[PDB]
Write a protein that binds this ligand. Structure first.
Ligand SMILES: C[n+]1cn([C@@H]2O[C@H](CO)[C@@H](O)[C@H]2O)c2nc(N)[nH]c(=O)c21
Ligand SMILES: [Mg+2]
Length: 299
């Protein structure tokens, strides 16, 4: 039986667990179950991309990648910057109830969509920008996605960001394998012009059962997958799989980098494993390797 003290990646100082015995139990369940029961649901911005780079270069968000493109109206990045100035403080307000935050985030994504309308746009601009950031993914991301593909594990990248940017980055990093799907806000085009974003709207606080559930198209791909790894860097990522009705065991992994001491309690109450300044996929990959080892024995 697997014991945490025998799993090196989980014994490191930066791996924090509120209840190590529960984490150990969940791991043993995933290993008993095999890869055929597993699915992954992961955030993109600052989960798949790094929170901290080695060379100190900045990493933009998926929206930032879009805003860096050259063929935007001269008005554009300034106007989105204004909207950011208004709504970002609200997004991170520590006192505001989630219901109020949700009203405001709906406003932000709506207005952002309305700005992103009325002019033509070539996806290749996005590709040119995204190409500069394929070197900014977490260490061993390539190996992680290769493991998932080899094991046939469905992997959903569930992002409140700009989907076209997410897809461009993953595709160019050679990790957008057939088992990987992206649910996000994609640019809508009509008669050759941008027309905002394709519904449904996905913002920071509805990445849950109200968007991803048993009526979703994606559900048919994963309805037999009751063991889930959920990965993200925000508290708002912890519910990404809440709409999967027959899940039996979920391991929630949170990457914590900003304001570590202030956020530590909340993160440890929300995630099963909290990874403090861990710019690698070595912990998720550890889980996959133990699942695969047993799969091989059973074969
Ligand atoms: C509509 N919106 C949300 N975010 C930000 O993207 C993050 C990742 O999903 C969100 O946390 C939010 O701060 C935006 N950023 C920019 N630059 N422009 C936007 O229109 C925008
Ligand atoms: Mg994120």
């Amino acid at each position: 039986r697997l014991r945490l003290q025998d799993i090196p990646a989980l014994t490191q100082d930066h791996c924090r667990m509120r209840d190590p015995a529960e984490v150990e139990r969940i791991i043993n369940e995933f290993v008993i179950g095999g890869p055929e029961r597993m699915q992954i649901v992961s955030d993109f911005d600052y989960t798949i991309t790094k929170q901290r780079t080695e060379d100190g270069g900045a990493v933009p968000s998926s929206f930032g990648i879009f805003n860096a493109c050259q063929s935007l109206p001269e008005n554009f990045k300034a106007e989105t910057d204004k909207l950011y100035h208004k709504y970002r403080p609200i997004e991170i307000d520590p006192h505001m109830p989630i219901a109020e935050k949700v009203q405001y985030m709906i406003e932000w994504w709506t207005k952002s969509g309305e700005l992103t309308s009325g002019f033509p746009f070539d996806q290749s601009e996005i590709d040119q920008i995204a190409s500069k950031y394929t070197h900014a993914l977490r260490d061993r991301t390539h190996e992680f996605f290769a493991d998932l593909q080899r094991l046939g594990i469905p992997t959903l990248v569930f992002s409140a960001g700009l989907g076209n940017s997410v897809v461009s980055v993953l595709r160019q990093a050679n990790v957008l394998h057939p088992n990987v799907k992206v649910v996000s806000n994609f640019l809508q085009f009509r008669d050759g012009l941008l027309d905002g974003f394709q519904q449904p709207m996905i913002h920071t606080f509805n990445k849950n059962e109200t968007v991803l559930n048993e009526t979703s198209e994606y559900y048919d791909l994963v309805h037999t997958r009751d063991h889930i790894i959920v990965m993200g860097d925000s508290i708002g990522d912890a519910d990404m799989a809440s709409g999967v009705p027959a899940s039996s065991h979920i391991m929630k992994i949170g990457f914590l980098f900003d304001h570590v001491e202030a956020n530590m309690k909340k993160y440890m109450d929300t995630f099963d494993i909290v990874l403090v300044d861990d710019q690698t996929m070595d912990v998720p990959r550890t889980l996959l390797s133990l699942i695969e080892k047993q799969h091989k024995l059973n074969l």
